[PDB]
Subunit: 239 residues, 3 copies
Amino acid sequence: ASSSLYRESGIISARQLALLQRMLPRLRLEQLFRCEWLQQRLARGLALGREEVRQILLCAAQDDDGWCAELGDRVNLAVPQSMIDWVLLPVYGWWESLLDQAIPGWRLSLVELETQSRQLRIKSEFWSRVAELEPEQAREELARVAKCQARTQEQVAELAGKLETASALAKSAWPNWQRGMATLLASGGLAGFEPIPEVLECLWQPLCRLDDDVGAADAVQAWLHERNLCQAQDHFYWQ
Amino acid sequence: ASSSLYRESGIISARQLALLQRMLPRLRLEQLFRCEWLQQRLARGLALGREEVRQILLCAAQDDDGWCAELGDRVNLAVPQSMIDWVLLPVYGWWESLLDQAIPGWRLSLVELETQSRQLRIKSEFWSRVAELEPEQAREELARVAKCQARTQEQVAELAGKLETASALAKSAWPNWQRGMATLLASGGLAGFEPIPEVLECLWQPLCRLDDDVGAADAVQAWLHERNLCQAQDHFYWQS
Amino acid sequence: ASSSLYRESGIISARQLALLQRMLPRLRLEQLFRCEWLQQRLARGLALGREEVRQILLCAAQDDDGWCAELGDRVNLAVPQSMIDWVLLPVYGWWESLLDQAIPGWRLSLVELETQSRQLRIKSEFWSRVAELEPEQAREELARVAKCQARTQEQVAELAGKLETASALAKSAWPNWQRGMATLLASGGLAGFEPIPEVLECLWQPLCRLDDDVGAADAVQAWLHERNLCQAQDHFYWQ
């Protein structure tokens, strides 16, 4: 929900943010950053190009507090990279949390912990170099932070472990997940993915008939959208 | 003003910095980092490319202490992206300042206020992870970071307030600024912007004749220059 | 040697890391992060492209404990930016430490101090923004940070000094280093270096014939590899 966040993760360049900042009033800008669409691109690390920017500017040209709802991308699933970023990765993520709903919370919890271990090593160098002067005071602080990184390390280990077991269970349920992804990055097909877990069948049928069937695009959009894996105004097609 | 500002802002890649560090003496590197040209690119978000790097190395080899003064870009105002980043946006920031000179100061103050804000969050997410092991000596940090965040929040509200008001007049003074920008972005032309404020006429006249008049380019170069919106050696031109 | 470092250094994008995290097991991924080839890209600021990620994924399939020693780049030395990033800069770094072994360590110690002063600089801005409510507490707090950015700042001066002298000696040993570089960026050849130090003769001979002798690019690769300047699987050519 913050400029810096989209900047730190490379979603928006400084150049782009400059234009956006000047064209959109603070109120629209804030709505932009909070909107489901952009938050989606953030989570998938999908940086903006000139048309994304044009479309944002275009949509905001009406004083409708719901302008963000018209935002969405036209994705060509015939491009593996697009198939991966807009479909497979999102779907696998949704699927695993289905096996165990606490998993996304673990993965996210993890990152908050490593970025937290850093602040601990950085705050260690500090009171380390500082030990020069006020040596008695630094010792004090060092003992304090020493305890923290010890616990932080342990919380990480136990989380990792749960995820190790979780991934094992998921590997058992979709063994061909890996062989499928390689076949995609070469042949471009989705067959190496079979047999796919049952729940995914309603997605996989149309997904495999994208070039043959007309209403398969709509079928895939609709399946993802119900499952909250795409936007109402996202559109998918094939080469 | 350190190389870190330029790395974080994606103005200079890691690859590029390494080459510059090897080729430029420590003293020239710092002169480069503080020079007006590179500062302009930073503010505008204009990442360096092969040529910008070469020119840096070139100009720096003269060994004159004002070598930075020879740095500039050759800019094709054909490209809508170039028209926007080198003219429209700088010019609008300048125009804006006429209507109220305190504005530029307010904007960057927000930037620093946002940073201080972010810093306080990192500082609270930090002491939250400590609150578990150090329950007692954590009730003190949260109290200061409380008022700190509150205060910070107050002034943002104020700044954002003044700027919201300024925006309103600024909109009134150039109604079709929006429309003009949409059009340029959709079709490449400048017509959507008119009528333009009278104080920008001597810039606009040449701007709309880049392709036709031969002295139209340097006429906008001169206009921007006399107002510190470009560098002495920045060269503009038109080619479609 | 963590993901976060490769992100901040702009070596791996958010979306690239998204895919690797999902495709590689926790163990397999950390192996990638600590492997020589990737540490090489990192040292030189060489961002992963589409090719590099495919390779990482193919080589991940082998499923042996040393997969990531098969990783290497294919570089076209006919491209000047490649000539610089893979040969000239690496070779110079190696050369200069022949003149004085302490130089790489100074160079690296600067970096540590530079990121450290900018850590205290940001710490100042904060406590001056917090001096709004606490003038007293923020005093001894700004006072400590001020001592640190003092010692830091002199350590830097001492190192810069030592490097200033080194610089002079290296300039005397390879006078046309700079003219060569300028020329390569201008005309794309290597004659501008031409009076090169004797210890580089064996590298220089084949480097000047990449286009003419089939075996030249291999000679170059050998020269580099025997001195740990490229990976065993790095491969060079001229197109």
